[PDB]
From Swiss-Prot:
UniProt PTM: The precursor is cleaved by a furin endopeptidase. Phosphorylated.
Stated name of the protein: Disintegrin and metalloproteinase domain-containing protein 17
Tissue specificity remark: Ubiquitously expressed. Expressed at highest levels in adult heart, placenta, skeletal muscle, pancreas, spleen, thymus, prostate, testes, ovary and small intestine, and in fetal brain, lung, liver and kidney. Expressed in natural killer cells (at protein level).
Subcellular location: Cell membrane
Catalytic residues identified in the record: 189
Functional note: Transmembrane metalloprotease which mediates the ectodomain shedding of a myriad of transmembrane proteins including adhesion proteins, growth factor precursors and cytokines important for inflammation and immunity. Cleaves the membrane-bound precursor of TNF-alpha to its mature soluble form. Responsible for the proteolytical release of soluble JAM3 from endothelial cells surface.
Subunit and interaction comment: Interacts with MAD2L1, MAPK14 and MUC1. Interacts with iRhom1/RHBDF1 and iRhom2/RHBDF2. Interacts with FRMD8 via its interaction with iRhom1/RHBDF1 and iRhom2/RHBDF2. Interacts with TSPAN8.
Shown residues in whole-protein numbering: 218 to 475 of 824
Domain notes: Must be membrane anchored to cleave the different substrates. The cytoplasmic domain is not required for the this activity. Only the catalytic domain is essential to shed TNF and p75 TNFR.
Induction notes from the record: In arthritis-affected cartilage.
Residues reported in the UniProt entry to bind Zn(2+): 188, 192, 198
Glycosylation sites: 47, 235
Superkingdom of origin organism: Eukaryota
Length: 258
């Protein structure tokens, strides 16, 4: 592991919902929450041996936190990830999650091109229990993204956007999720960014029963995280991430800041 290039620097964005509902309308409260969350997630990554040997010490660090204190005013017909209304259905508490990730990537393109990853933290109740979403680590045909900006020309947006993005919501079923749960959401989404796909039931090694420590972080269904494996990456995730981690590291990782 190149100690000069072992850290994925992040642009962390807190939208107006997060600022108000998690931040208590305060910059300090907002940033402290995020700084502490990323550092705990970093502990998970940093201590992971991607090859089950000495290939460890790779992690994440915040480069900048953008704090949006109020909604983005928009003209009629125009949309922005930080606008007051949910999209496509303004009657709902939250956006459609996929459309939100696409919108965030579009609006943040200039900034995203200069960082390893951009991550949006929001506070909206996505339909049916969804907590987050990210590019990378998806089995879908022609899907791409994850660490290090990769361009995608949006025929609808008429410009290049980058696929080095993901998002976390700390609201689910009308309540703020536990910090232990939030940590797991962000870990899972960055896991996709790093190259992991969902662990399959079909491989017991990567999806243990509850008495064998429970599921690992990349399981498709969320859990509170009281089981042993919950906060760790499975061997399946490690294998996937390891195929490209070094290469990606040479591309856009930087030196850890003490
Ligand atoms: C951190 C988690 C694992 C992220 C995933 C979505 C995903 O794979 N993002 O990369 C999620 O929101 N999972 C939901 C989830 O498990 N939520 C739990 C909290 C839930 O609602 N459980 C009971 C609802 N029947 C789904 C979509 C499976 C309902
Ligand atoms: Zn997932």
């Amino acid at each position: 592991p190149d100690p000069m290039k072992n850290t994925c620097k992040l642009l962390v964005v807190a939208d107006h919902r997060f600022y108000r509902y998690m931040g208590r309308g305060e910059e300090s409260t907002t940033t402290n929450y995020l700084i502490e969350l990323i550092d705990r997630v970093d502990d998970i990554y940093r201590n992971t041996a991607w090859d089950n040997a000495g290939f460890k010490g790779y992690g994440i660090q915040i480069e900048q936190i953008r704090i949006l204190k109020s909604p983005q005013e928009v003209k009629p017909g125009e949309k922005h990830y930080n606008m007051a209304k949910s999209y496509p259905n303004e009657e709902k508490d939250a956006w459609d999650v996929k459309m939100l990730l696409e919108q965030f990537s579009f609006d943040i393109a200039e900034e995203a091109s200069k960082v390893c990853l951009a991550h949006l933290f929001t506070y909206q109740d996505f339909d049916m229990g969804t907590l987050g979403l990210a590019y990378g680590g998806s089995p879908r045909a022609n899907s791409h993204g994850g660490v290090c900006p990769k361009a995608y020309y949006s025929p609808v947006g008429k410009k290049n956007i980058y696929l080095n993005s993901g998002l976390t919501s700390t609201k689910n079923y009308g309540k703020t999720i536990l910090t232990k749960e939030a940590d797991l959401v962000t870990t899972h989404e960055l896991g996709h960014n790093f190259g992991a796909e969902h662990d399959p039931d079909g491989l017991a090694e990567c999806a243990p029963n509850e008495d064998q420590g429970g599921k690992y972080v990349m399981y498709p269904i969320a859990v509170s995280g009281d089981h042993e494996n919950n906060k760790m990456f499975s061997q399946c995730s490690k294998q996937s991430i390891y195929k490209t981690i070094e290469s990606k590291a040479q591309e856009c990782f930087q030196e850890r800041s003490n």
